[PDB]
């Protein structure tokens, strides 16, 4: 409603770095809000695509940002009559970023890893890795829970049970308010998908450089399965956290699995011990229900609500024809201990191949009426196919079925405007929360400031 679509702020990075693939707000130790931006195809030292992370200070004019430096050299350790190898070429550093307190977490979901023992090997595979930084202090640390030193032959004997070689940890990420980092790994357990949790503080105290394989005892990984419903389900494609069991001392996890049960797609809500509390199944196959998940209380009852994006849902139209437009589902948490029922609201895109619901960002309370609001991305929507971001406002009964404001892409065709979103933070300190939009196709990030209501 009250986002300013006239005077935008533009940040930008190198040509072809996919600057804007992922973004989040970052408050330093003094509370000064900055923007951290992931550019997963930034060139490294060897002039090879490695990805990179930028930390953008708030300036109404915008412009270029300084890099948040990480080590980009491949590592090798000859220990225990084995050889450990990390390969950072095309690792995609910055494919997801997230901030918590004065710490930044950026991940390289396609960092490869292999172990050599004489003639055998573990196989060179993308375990993924996340990098952690405290920009003010210069502290650095890594976390790579799916690295292993088990050889290829062993996995064959046990029928590839507990195979963490292709996790792609850091594909999606989130941090609980208590400081527990949660990594989605859609390739873990032979593309069933897994989650990895570990306190940030214990990631720093247990990391030393050059070790490559180290223990983090306070960590917790989800579990393999023999159920074919979970096969190739990419469990961990998207992740979020919320409060869904009534116990405020426990934090619950929300996980998207958009190819669950033979591309039906599903979203599950779990406790911190990965025990299943509810499961929302997809409405239509290959709709990618679960591509994106968002948690926020939209109807002002103190109970977090769930939003799920199916950017490929095909809407039924006249003459028995179908049109891929995308769809967003709203689930209102009921009073006390009860299951989340049918969707309270169905939001369906309009533009063909617009992928309405590819990204869903909690905005906070935008118009300051007492109900939290959201933004929904249609990165190839709008009449021109350039991309659109749609705002929907909260209300006592959920959300308004029609948008209050529509943000047309100020970038050229193919920018993927809206592919990444983040709101609910006041960056210019004017009392109203603001929105940042990513267009990695144009290598830029647009900042929309919220103004008093007209």
């Amino acid at each position, epitope marked *: 409603l009250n986002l300013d679509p006239v005077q935008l702020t533009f940040y930008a990075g190198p040509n072809g770095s996919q600057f804007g693939f992922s973004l989040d707000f970052h408050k330093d130790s003094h509370g000064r809000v900055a923007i951290v931006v992931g550019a997963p195809r930034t060139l490294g030292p060897s002039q090879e695509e490695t990805g990179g992370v930028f930390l953008c200070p708030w300036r109404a004019e915008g412009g270029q940002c300084p890099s948040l430096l990480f080590d980009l050299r491949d590592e090798t350790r000859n*220990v*225990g*009559s084995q050889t450990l190898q990390t390969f950072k070429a095309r690792q995609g550093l910055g494919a997801s970023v997230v901030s918590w307190s004065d710490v930044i977490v950026a991940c390289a979901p396609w960092q490869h890893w292999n172990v050599l023992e004489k003639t055998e090997e573990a196989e060179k595979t993308p375990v993924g890795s996340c990098f952690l930084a405290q920009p003010e202090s210069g502290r650095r640390a890594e976390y790579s829970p799916c690295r292993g030193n088990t050889l290829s032959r062993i996995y064959v004997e046990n029928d590839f049970s507990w195979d963490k070689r292709y996790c792609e940890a850091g594909f999606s990420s989130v941090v609980t308010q208590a400081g527990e980092l949660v990594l989605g790994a859609p390739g873990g357990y032979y593309f069933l998908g897994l989650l990895a949790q570990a306190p940030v503080a214990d990631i720093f105290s247990s*990391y*030393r450089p050059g070790i490559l394989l180290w*223990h983090v005892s306070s960590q917790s990984l989800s579990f393999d399965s023999s159920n074919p419903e979970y096969f190739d389900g990419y469990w961990g494609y998207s992740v979020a956290v919320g409060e869904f069991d009534g116990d405020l001392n426990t934090t619950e996890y929300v996980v998207g699995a958009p190819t669950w049960s033979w591309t039906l797609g599903a979203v599950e809500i779990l406790d911190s011990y990965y025990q299943r509390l509810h499961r929302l199944r997809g409405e239509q196959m290959a709709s990618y229900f679960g591509h994106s998940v968002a948690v926020t209380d939209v109807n002002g009852d103190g109970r977090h609500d769930l939003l799920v994006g199916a950017p490929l849902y095909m809407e039924s139209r006249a003459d028995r024809k179908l049109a891929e437009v995308g769809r967003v589902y709203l689930f209102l948490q009921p009073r006390g201990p009860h299951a989340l029922g049918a969707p309270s609201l169905l939001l369906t895109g309009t533009q063909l191949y617009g992928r309405f619901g590819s990204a869903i960002a909690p905005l906070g309370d935008l118009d300051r009426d007492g109900y939290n609001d959201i933004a929904v991305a249609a990165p190839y929507g709008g009449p021109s196919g350039r991309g659109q971001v749609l705002v929907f406002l909260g209300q006592s009964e959920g959300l308004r079925s029609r948008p209050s404001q529509v943000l047309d892409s100020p970038f050229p065709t193919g920018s993927a405007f809206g592919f990444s979103l983040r709101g609910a933070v006041d960056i210019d300190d004017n009392g109203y929360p603001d929105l940042i939009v990513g267009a990695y196709g144009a290598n830029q990030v647009a900042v929309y400031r919220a103004q008093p209501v007209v």
Partner: antibody
């Protein structure tokens, strides 16, 4: 806290067998590797072998192949070291070891089990 | 197997002295070495791993250094508890192998 509580001192005859235990306290035995080390005053410290209690796979110094046998039961959270056809040279103190962070290190140690072989 | 030559076998020193134990390997091990402490009639406590990193809880007066096939353990300002046996251990290759041991004795 991490603590390795080993079995009590044993007093056996040559040719017989003994089975020392190493019970985990304040952590799951399944987490890391578990090594066994032999200590004598003259010969000093010698590495027996290791086990990964998550899967049971083991490695041994060729010198102990035959006498040492390392096992692990995650249920009782204990790791075991079996010795067979004992000899006066097997009279030593035996420690179980695990690493802190580094997968391959030797940082946490048990109190040690005292073994005496004599007729 | 890799032979770990630890020197000296023993040394007589006093409180507050700054002493250095060394450990020489038959080949390179690229800092894959640890340092241990066994107080008289007791068990072992981890001091260093990966050549330089301190085990949690150990004081900062201990410090490891070195590279290739020559490493060192240094204690700045000895304490009354530091008089004990010290061993090095390599884990670059299997089987792991230890050093002969070094005992710190009170001088008089």
């Amino acid at each position: 806290e991490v603590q390795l509580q080993q079995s009590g001192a044993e007093l056996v005859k040559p040719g017989a067998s003994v089975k020392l235990s190493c019970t985990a306290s304040g952590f799951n035995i399944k987490d890391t590797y578990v090594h066994w080390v032999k200590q004598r005053p003259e010969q000093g410290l010698e590495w027996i072998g290791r086990i990964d209690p998550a899967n049971g796979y083991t490695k041994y110094d060729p010198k102990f192949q035959g006498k040492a046998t390392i096992t692990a039961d995650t249920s009782s959270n204990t790791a075991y070291l079996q010795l067979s056809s004992l000899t006066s040279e097997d009279t030593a103190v035996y420690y179980c070891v695990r690493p802190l962070y580094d997968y391959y290190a030797m940082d946490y140690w048990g109190q040690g089990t005292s073994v005496t072989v004599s007729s | 197997d890799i032979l770990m030559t630890q020197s000296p076998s023993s040394m007589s020193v006093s409180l507050g002295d700054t002493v250095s134990i060394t450990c020489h390997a038959s080949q390179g091990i690229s800092s894959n070495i640890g340092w241990l402490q066994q107080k008289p009639g007791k068990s072992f406590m981890g001091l260093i791993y990966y050549g330089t990193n301190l085990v949690d809880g150990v004081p900062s007066r201990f410090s490891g250094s070195g590279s290739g096939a020559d490493y060192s353990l240094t204690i700045s300002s000895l304490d009354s508890e530091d008089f004990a046996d010290y061993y090095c251990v390599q884990y670059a290759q299997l089987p792991y192998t230890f050093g002969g041991g070094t005992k710190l004795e009170i001088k008089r």
